């Protein structure tokens, strides 16, 4: 309770399966200010640590207790926000200390799940926030400055794209960085080239050959990041097409939520349009890309595509 | 015996034997752009940056 | 140990014979350091440092104090043996022995002072030793810098940046040593050593500050600044002709742009080098960014003297790319953009081409690059108000107070409208960017960051001012933005 | 066919905002606290042409003006002239 | 009718009642109106030509002279009677913007 | 490498006597060979004509100019 390490040791000694139960009992005893703020600090640190350490238990024995912990966090966040924001700021500062010390060697699926829970909990629709907007630009920097050269980084980008898709389905904003991420991922997947050299990718080793069945039984998004990101070094074409379809589905969801309202979706998608046309000319059996092209063509037909009226203001009296 | 030169908000008339600033024009607001004499050698016209 | 006992004996002291024996022991310390290459006396080298201090004290005593020909020959031989032992310890210090290198450098400097006061060849031998020295982490530091040495970097940072006379004789002896064939190849191998020795920005030709004198009697080291320029230019032409790599290439481009120009005397040879650099366009993604500083040098070259580069704005249109956004020199490149596009003979076609290229760039560009490009766009539009039609067409806007015939005509015009801008067209004058509006600036309106969105609202609102302070709104980064937001 | 050159609008000077579209002596007069021949002779001592507009006078002679006027006694300014 | 000077023309000078000069960009084309076509063209200039004037029937060994300044202090004197052949030149360090003759 | 090809070509396209003098002041044979290798044929021809007229004007200048 008083110390994060001490309370983590107590929870581990009691049980990893019912650390949520032990912490809930302790918090109920305590609520019955500073004590509960320290409990919130230790609970956030402990759930991040658990996400970093272990996910071997299945949905029926680990996801249930994780969701119980999430509910306890919802209760303590509905009861307290100031201490939670302060520890969020500290957690930031330590993230960027880690990142400046090691650009890629000091990140965590714990940071990713922290971002996800922050987005789920807070009123993400706010234009400016002491927590959301800082973490928003931190997430942008995370997805942009990472030297994309491996499938674990690709999956990190994919989960970041999913969380910002939630962000801009509840907020409806636009990210040129996620556009660049999509273009870079497509180019590094189909590098195997002559039509795209301004994207400046990093890795010349991974591609996409014509040995995929792309069926429904073929591995879907099914994101087990706490396992996929650490077993992704073994690289089958099934895993490659699964992550490709994951990023493509997130791209389509972002389109259908915000980018239809985006006025320049046509010129946003033009590089993606060329990449997907190359996809179709190379494979000729990609139904989801076909539907994406149909949707973009529909948007081009329905958009005004007319010169704007930016400098049209009313006269002064 | 004389010629006109444009400059910053300033039109200068110089002589030939003296080659000195003979006449000064500074009633412009912004920099002048063009200067031209008439065939009769009396009127000089200047195009400025005010239109 | 034995070194300390010899030190005590020499301090207490046949005094010439004892000093000769101590000098022989300090020359045997070259073999001690050779064995130290495998293990520096259990990786401590404390005895070696004590022996070096003893040798320095003995050399000082010998310089203070000293068959006259035989005695002078013996004293000079002992002093030269100590200096050569220090030079060999510095040269063969493949292992990173910081204390041993520092002791060797201090002993060599003291011996050089004593020789200059009582006895140039010692200087060239010292430089030969320092350049024959090589370390694994020192050879071609690729992430940053030129050569992450130890001995030559400390030599520069506490010995070269202080004495202008030593700088003058320094460059003269490099000219001599480069005329020397084998050591010319030595410099060719250790190019980055000179880069690390020269990027320190406090050289003699920098008349902004003054450098104090090492030798009590400087032998006419202020004979000619143009002679200093000639030595600088000869050394630099030799090094740029020999053994160039990518990181050293970028570093020499930076030092040329910022520091060499005050120190160089063959600007036409710099012209040829810089135009080769700017026309250097290959498939290397790492070598495709040199044209930035290459054009920086070329343009300051054009300013210093009036020469040409054909299809200049053609090359700018070609060179503008998102790789510029991804590289970290885009701040200086935007200063360059200011000083090019500030001309008064540019046209609507050129400004429209550049603004549309930058609009696609800000459609796909990082937010720091967005806040760098916003002031440029605003100032460019304000300077050339001819692009108000593409900012908002007056024919495409509607009004209730006009006839249904014109309503139908406007509807048909909107139906038959098409965007005619061409991206692949390398001619800024030929790209029909006048008709193309900025849906990309509309997306910038619909950005996500609050500060960027406010800058977008500034774009949308009518242009009331001219001064936008490009410098203050020019250098921004992710970390800087986070610091500002937290503050 | 690019050409290079070397003008300023309303600009700040000693926390006072004065236009670049007015003659130099009288811009310095409208600088608060100082007056007619104060401005005239500070221009004279700064050694600039008196027929110019404040769009001219780039920053180095601008700062000579500032330093001379803010150190008047150190430039042989007579006490009976001082305020 | 129009006669094409592809690069941006910055000067048009009616040198003669039948001939004109288009002075723009690096080169300059001397056209004739009656033939509606360029009699000659000279591209002997270094950068874009910035100014061009003409003088005729004055006290000189050469009857007519054509001056052109091309942004280098580089002023060059040609002559229409010699098909605008190089006759003289001066170079002034500052890039000249205008030139003229009495 | 250290050639002066672009300056030679510019001077020959616009025959600036001062610039051509400053660029012929040099005497490095490797640079001479590199220039004339990366020089245009007709431009080098008119360059040779310029060298001829300068040797005629100042035969004292022809010393290092005898190898151009």
From Swiss-Prot, chain A:
User: Which domain of life does the protein's organism represent?
Assistant: Eukaryota
Query: Where is this gene product found?
Result: Nucleus, Nucleolus
Leader sequence segment: none
**Which family is it part of?**
Belongs to the NOP14 family.
Say what the protein does.
Involved in nucleolar processing of pre-18S ribosomal RNA. Has a role in the nuclear export of 40S pre-ribosomal subunit to the cytoplasm.
Q: How does it assemble?
A: Interacts with snoRNA U3. Interacts with EMG1, MPP10 and NOC4. Component of the ribosomal small subunit (SSU) processome composed of at least 40 protein subunits and snoRNA U3.
Q: What is this protein called?
A: Nucleolar complex protein 14
Gene it is expressed from = NOP14
From Swiss-Prot, chain B:
Q: Where in the cell is it found?
A: Nucleus, Nucleolus
Q: Which residues cross the membrane?
A: none
Q: Where are the WD repeats?
A: 1-26, 27-51
Question: Superkingdom of the source?
Answer: Eukaryota
| More details | Present with 358 molecules/cell in log phase SD medium.
Function, as annotated: Involved in nucleolar processing of pre-18S ribosomal RNA. Required for optimal pre-ribosomal RNA transcription by RNA polymerase I together with a subset of U3 proteins required for transcription (t-UTPs).
Quaternary state and partners of this protein? Answer: Interacts with snoRNA U3. Interacts with MPP10. Component of the ribosomal small subunit (SSU) processome composed of at least 40 protein subunits and snoRNA U3. In the absence of snoRNA3, forms a complex with other t-UTPs. This complex can associate with pre-18S ribosomal RNAs.
Q: What is this protein called?
A: U3 small nucleolar RNA-associated protein 15
Organism per entry? Saccharomyces cerevisiae (strain ATCC 204508 / S288c) (Baker's yeast)
Task: Tell which residues of the whole protein are contained here.
Answer: 53 to 103 of 513
Swiss-Prot record, chain D:
Mostly located where? cytoplasm
Q: Does the keyword Heme apply?
A: no
A GO cellular component entry from the record: cytosolic small ribosomal subunit
Q: Where in the cell is it found?
A: Cytoplasm
Q: How is it modified after translation?
A: N-terminally acetylated by acetyltransferase NatA.
Any GO MF annotation of the entry:
rRNA binding
Residue numbers of N-acetylserine PTMs = 1
Indicate the cross-link positions, Glycyl lysine isopeptide (Lys-Gly) (interchain with G-Cter in ubiquitin).
32, 45, 76
PTM sites of type N6-methyllysine: 44
Stretch forming the signal peptide: none
Protein family = Belongs to the universal ribosomal protein uS13 family.
Q: What does this protein do?
A: Component of the ribosome, a large ribonucleoprotein complex responsible for the synthesis of proteins in the cell. The small ribosomal subunit (SSU) binds messenger RNAs (mRNAs) and translates the encoded message by selecting cognate aminoacyl-transfer RNA (tRNA) molecules. The large subunit (LSU) contains the ribosomal catalytic site termed the peptidyl transferase center (PTC), which catalyzes the formation of peptide bonds, thereby polymerizing the amino acids delivered by tRNAs into a polypeptide chain.
Q: How does it assemble?
A: Component of the small ribosomal subunit (SSU). Mature yeast ribosomes consist of a small (40S) and a large (60S) subunit. The 40S small subunit contains 1 molecule of ribosomal RNA (18S rRNA) and 33 different proteins (encoded by 57 genes). The large 60S subunit contains 3 rRNA molecules (25S, 5.8S and 5S rRNA) and 46 different proteins (encoded by 81 genes).
Q: What further fact does the record state?
A: Present with 48100 molecules/cell in log phase SD medium.
Protein name per UniProt: Small ribosomal subunit protein uS13A
Q: Give the originating organism.
A: Saccharomyces cerevisiae (strain ATCC 204508 / S288c)
Could you say which residues of the full protein are shown? Answer: 2 to 87 of 146
Swiss-Prot record, chain F:
Localisation: Nucleus, Nucleolus
Start-end of the WD repeats? 38-68
What does the miscellaneous comment read?
Present with 33100 molecules/cell in log phase SD medium.
What exactly does this protein do? Involved in nucleolar processing of pre-18S ribosomal RNA. Required for optimal pre-ribosomal RNA transcription by RNA polymerase I together with a subset of U3 proteins required for transcription (t-UTPs).
* Family from the record: Belongs to the UTP5 family.
Assembly = Interacts with snoRNA U3. Interacts with MPP10. Component of the ribosomal small subunit (SSU) processome composed of at least 40 protein subunits and snoRNA U3. In the absence of snoRNA3, forms a complex with other t-UTPs. This complex can associate with pre-18S ribosomal RNAs.
User: What is the designated name of this protein?
Assistant: U3 small nucleolar RNA-associated protein 5
Q: What organism is recorded for this protein?
A: Saccharomyces cerevisiae (strain ATCC 204508 / S288c) (Baker's yeast)
**Which start and end residues of the full protein are shown?**
434 to 501 of 643
């Amino acid at each position: 309770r008083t110390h994060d390490a001490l309370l983590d040791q107590v929870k581990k000694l009691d049980l990893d399966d019912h650390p949520k139960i032990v912490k809930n009992i302790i918090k109920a005893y305590q609520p019955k200010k500073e004590k509960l703020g320290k409990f919130t600090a230790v609970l956030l640190r402990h759930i991040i640590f658990l996400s970093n350490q272990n996910y071997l238990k299945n949905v029926q024995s680990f996801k249930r207790t994780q969701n119980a912990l999430i509910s306890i966090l919802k209760s303590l966040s509905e009861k307290y926000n100031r201490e939670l924001s302060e520890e969020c700021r500290d957690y930031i500062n330590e993230m960027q200390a880690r990142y400046k010390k090691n650009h890629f060697d000091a990140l965590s699926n714990g940071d990713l799940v922290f971002f996800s829970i922050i987005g789920i909990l807070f009123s993400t629709s706010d234009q400016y926030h002491l927590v959301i907007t800082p973490a928003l630009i931190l997430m942008s920097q995370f997805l942009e400055q990472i030297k994309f050269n491996s499938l674990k980084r690709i999956a990190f980008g994919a989960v970041l794209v999913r969380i910002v898709s939630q962000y801009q389905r509840i907020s409806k904003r636009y990210i040129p960085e996620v556009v660049y991420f999509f273009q870079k991922i497509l180019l590094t997947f189909i590098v195997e080239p002559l039509d795209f050299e301004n994207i400046r990718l990093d890795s010349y080793e991974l591609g996409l050959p014509l040995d995929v069945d792309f069926t429904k039984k073929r591995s879907t998004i099914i994101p087990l990041h706490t396992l996929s990101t650490m077993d992704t070094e073994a690289h089958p074409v099934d895993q490659c097409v699964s992550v490709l379809l994951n990023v493509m589905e997130s791209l389509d969801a972002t389109i259908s939520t915000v980018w239809k309202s985006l006025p320049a979706f046509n010129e946003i998608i033009l590089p993606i349009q060329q990449l997907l046309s190359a996809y179709t000319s190379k494979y000729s059996d990609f139904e989801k890309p076909r539907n994406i092209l149909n949707k973009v063509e529909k948007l081009t037909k329905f958009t005004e595509h007319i010169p704007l009226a930016l400098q049209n203001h009313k006269p002064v009296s | 015996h004389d010629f006109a030169v444009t400059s910053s908000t300033r039109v200068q008339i110089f002589s030939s034997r003296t080659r000195q600033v003979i006449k000064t024009f500074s009633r412009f607001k912004d920099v002048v752009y063009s200067a031209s004499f008439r065939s009769d050698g009396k009127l000089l016209c200047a195009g400025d940056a005010t239109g | 140990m034995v070194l300390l006992i010899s030190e005590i004996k020499d301090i207490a002291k046949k005094q010439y014979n004892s000093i000769i024996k101590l000098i022989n022991e300090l020359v045997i310390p070259e073999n001690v350091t050779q064995l130290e290459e495998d293990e520096t006396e259990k990786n401590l080298r404390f005895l070696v440092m004590s022996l070096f201090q003893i040798f320095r004290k003995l050399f000082s005593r010998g310089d203070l104090t000293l068959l006259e020909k035989e005695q002078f020959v013996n004293w000079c031989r002992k002093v030269y043996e100590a200096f050569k032992t220090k030079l060999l310890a510095i040269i063969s210090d493949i292992p990173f022995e910081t204390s041993l290198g520092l002791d060797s450098l201090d002993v060599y400097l003291q011996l050089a002072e004593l020789e200059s006061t009582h006895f140039n060849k010692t200087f060239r031998k010292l430089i030969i030793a320092l350049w024959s020295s090589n370390m694994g982490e020192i050879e071609d530091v690729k992430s940053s810098g030129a050569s992450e040495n130890l001995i030559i970097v400390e030599f520069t940072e506490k010995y070269y940046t202080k004495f202008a006379d030593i700088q003058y004789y320094f460059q003269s002896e490099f000219n001599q040593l480069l005329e020397d064939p084998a050591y010319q190849d030595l410099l060719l191998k250790n190019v980055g050593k000179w880069l690390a020795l020269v990027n320190h920005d406090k050289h003699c030709s920098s008349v902004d500050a003054d450098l104090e004198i090492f030798v009590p009697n400087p032998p006419q080291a202020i004979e000619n600044e143009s002679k200093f320029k000639s030595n600088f230019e000869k050394n630099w032409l030799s090094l740029l002709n020999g053994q160039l790599s990518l990181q050293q290439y970028k570093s020499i481009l930076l030092i040329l742009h910022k520091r060499i120009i005050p120190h160089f005397h063959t600007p036409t040879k710099l012209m040829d080098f810089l135009t080769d650099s700017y026309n250097l366009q290959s498939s290397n993604k790492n070598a495709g960014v040199v044209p930035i500083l290459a054009l920086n040098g070329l343009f300051e070259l054009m300013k210093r003297f009036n020469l040409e580069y054909p299809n200049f704005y053609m090359k700018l249109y070609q060179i503008i790319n998102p790789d510029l956004m991804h590289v970290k020199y885009r701040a200086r490149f935007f200063r360059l953009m200011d000083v090019f596009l500030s001309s008064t003979h540019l046209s609507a076609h050129l400004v429209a081409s550049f603004i549309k290229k930058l609009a696609r760039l800000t459609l796909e560009s990082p937010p720091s690059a967005i806040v760098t490009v916003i002031p440029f766009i605003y100032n460019l539009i304000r300077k050339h108000p001819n692009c108000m039609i593409m900012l908002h067409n007056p024919a495409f806007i509607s009004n209730p107070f006009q006839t249904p015939d014109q309503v139908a005509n406007l509807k048909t015009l909107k139906e038959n409208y098409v965007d005619p801008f061409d991206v692949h067209e390398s001619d800024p004058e030929l790209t029909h960017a006048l008709d193309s509006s900025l849906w990309e600036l509309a997306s910038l309106m619909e950005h996500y960051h609050p500060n960027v969105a406010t800058l977008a609202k500034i774009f949308a609102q009518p242009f009331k001012k001219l001064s936008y302070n490009m410098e203050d709104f020019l250098d921004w980064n992710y970390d800087s933005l986070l610091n500002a937001e937290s503050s | 066919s690019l050409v290079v050159q070397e003008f300023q609008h309303i600009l700040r000077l000693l926390n006072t905002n004065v236009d670049g579209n007015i003659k130099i002596v009288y811009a310095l007069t409208t600088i608060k606290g100082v007056g007619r021949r104060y401005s005239n002779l500070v221009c004279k001592k700064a050694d600039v042409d008196l027929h110019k507009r404040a769009g001219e006078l780039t920053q180095e002679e601008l700062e000579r003006i500032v330093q001379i006027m803010q150190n008047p006694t150190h430039y042989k300014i007579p006490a009976w002239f001082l305020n | 009718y129009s006669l094409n000077h592809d690069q941006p023309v910055e000067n048009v000078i009616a040198v003669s009642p039948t001939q004109i000069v288009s002075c723009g960009g690096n080169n300059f084309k001397v056209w004739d109106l009656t033939s509606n076509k360029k009699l000659y063209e000279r591209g002997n200039f270094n950068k874009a030509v910035t100014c061009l004037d003409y003088v005729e029937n004055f006290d000189s060994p050469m009857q007519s002279a054509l001056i052109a300044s091309s942004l280098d202090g580089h002023v060059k004197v040609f002559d229409p009677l010699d098909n605008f052949q190089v006759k003289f030149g001066w170079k002034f360090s500052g890039p000249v913007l205008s030139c003229a003759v009495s | 490498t250290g050639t002066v090809t672009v300056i030679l070509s510019q001077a020959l396209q616009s025959n600036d006597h001062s610039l051509l003098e400053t660029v012929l002041n040099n005497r490095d044979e490797r640079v001479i060979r590199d220039t004339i290798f990366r020089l245009k044929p007709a431009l080098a021809v008119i360059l040779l004509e310029r060298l001829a007229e300068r040797i005629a004007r100042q035969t004292h200048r022809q010393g290092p100019l005898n190898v151009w």
